[PDB]
Design a protein around this ligand. Structure first.
Ligand SMILES: *CCC(=O)Nc1cccnc1
Ligand SMILES: C=CC(=O)Nc1cccnc1
Length: 346
């Protein structure tokens, strides 16, 4: 069994010449030569069977990625595991090798308007498919957008994804949330569980703003500071938008703040294309009900050079988890992971 930095990275004989390419979702990732397709691939090692949350997120990612088939969503090419549940300790997931991601690209590279437009198009094209399957990604951010050397873009990491559930979206004020803080929509801090499609659109808006300046637009340092950042740019919500927030603790918090005026997008992004800023405004709308939807965003003039709804496929059917994964014991989850990965065995 081959080793990488003192770890068991046991993928062969199909996959040889391991080069370490960093750490990610649940640990070690290497590129490797696939001796069957004759290309380098990425392989991630998952060791999740101790912990219920690890198993839940692993199972959720596998079920979704195996069901999805889209050019802008990372596929699973292969899964390596032991032949029996008793011997299964790790799972290796083999995916197309993507040389970089938008987090790394933004730390080092200025994007042309043409690149920003193309990246945004591919993000929305992928998101149209995800939403058409009644799935919410819920953790869109630059590091979950993979890019290859020709700038093909693929969304990854469906570990926090959920089936959409708008009739159960309501919650109290300051309800804790799992997804990455800088890309959280304002309503998460106020009255939302992140069970509607508008949650992902806000993330995309944040990603667009970050592509325009190479800096995150709302870099909050902790839970409520994230809302301070958002309101610092959008300004105080309107009476109508406050009236949509029925929860008193949430409403009254917002009423307690001094008045803040909107920062014009063209002052934050003086070099941006005006059509990009019109689309940004519509994605970063405070009221989730007024927020642009993915299909409308694709049809926006900013994306006219690429928009073609006949080449923007949807899922053949809505997604549904068989059981509520959030209260299954880890032995049933190991067993479900074994079953879900069975198709890749001899
Ligand atoms: C799908 C998320 C992903 O692979 N992102 C990433 C992992 C490790 C290092 N850099 C990016
Ligand atoms: C640590 C980086 C990483 O996980 N890289 C990766 C993932 C998927 C596809 N290509 C490359």
């Amino acid at each position: 069994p081959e080793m990488v930095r003192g770890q068991v990275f046991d993928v062969g004989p199909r996959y040889t010449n391991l080069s370490y390419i960093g750490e990610g979702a649940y640990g070690m990732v290497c590129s490797a030569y696939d001796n069957v397709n004759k290309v380098r691939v990425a392989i991630k090692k998952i060791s999740p069977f101790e912990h219920q949350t690890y198993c839940q997120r692993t199972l959720r990612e596998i079920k979704i990625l195996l069901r999805f088939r889209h050019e802008n969503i990372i596929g699973i090419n292969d899964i390596i595991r032991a032949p029996t549940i008793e011997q299964m300790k790790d799972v290796y997931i083999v995916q197309d090798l993507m040389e970089t991601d938008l987090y790394k690209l933004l730390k080092t590279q200025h994007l042309s308007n043409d690149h920003i437009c193309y990246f945004l198009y591919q993000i929305l094209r992928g998101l149209k498919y995800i939403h058409s399957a009644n799935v919410l990604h819920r953790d869109l951010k630059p590091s979950n957008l993979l890019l290859n050397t020709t700038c093909d873009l693929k969304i990854c990491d469906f570990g926090l994804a959920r089936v959409a559930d708008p009739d159960h979206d309501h919650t109290g004020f300051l309800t804790e949330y799992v997804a990455t803080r800088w890309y959280r929509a304002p309503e998460i801090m106020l009255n939302s569980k992140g069970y509607t499609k508008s949650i992902d659109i806000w993330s995309v808006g944040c990603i667009l703003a970050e592509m325009l300046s190479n800096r995150p637009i709302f870099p909050g340092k902790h839970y409520l500071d994230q809302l301070n950042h958002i309101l610092g740019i959008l300004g105080s919500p309107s009476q109508e938008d406050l009236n949509c927030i029925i929860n008193l603790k949430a409403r009254n918090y917002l009423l307690s703040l001094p008045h803040k005026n909107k920062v014009p997008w063209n002052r934050l992004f003086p070099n941006a294309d005006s059509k990009a800023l019109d689309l940004l405004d519509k994605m970063l709308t405070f009221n989730p009900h007024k927020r642009i939807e993915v299909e409308q965003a694709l049809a926006h003039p900013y994306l006219e050079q690429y928009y073609d709804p006949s080449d923007e496929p949807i899922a053949e059917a809505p997604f549904k988890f068989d059981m509520e994964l959030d209260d299954l014991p880890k032995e049933k989850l190991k067993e479900l992971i074994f079953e879900e990965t069975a198709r890749f065995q001899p």
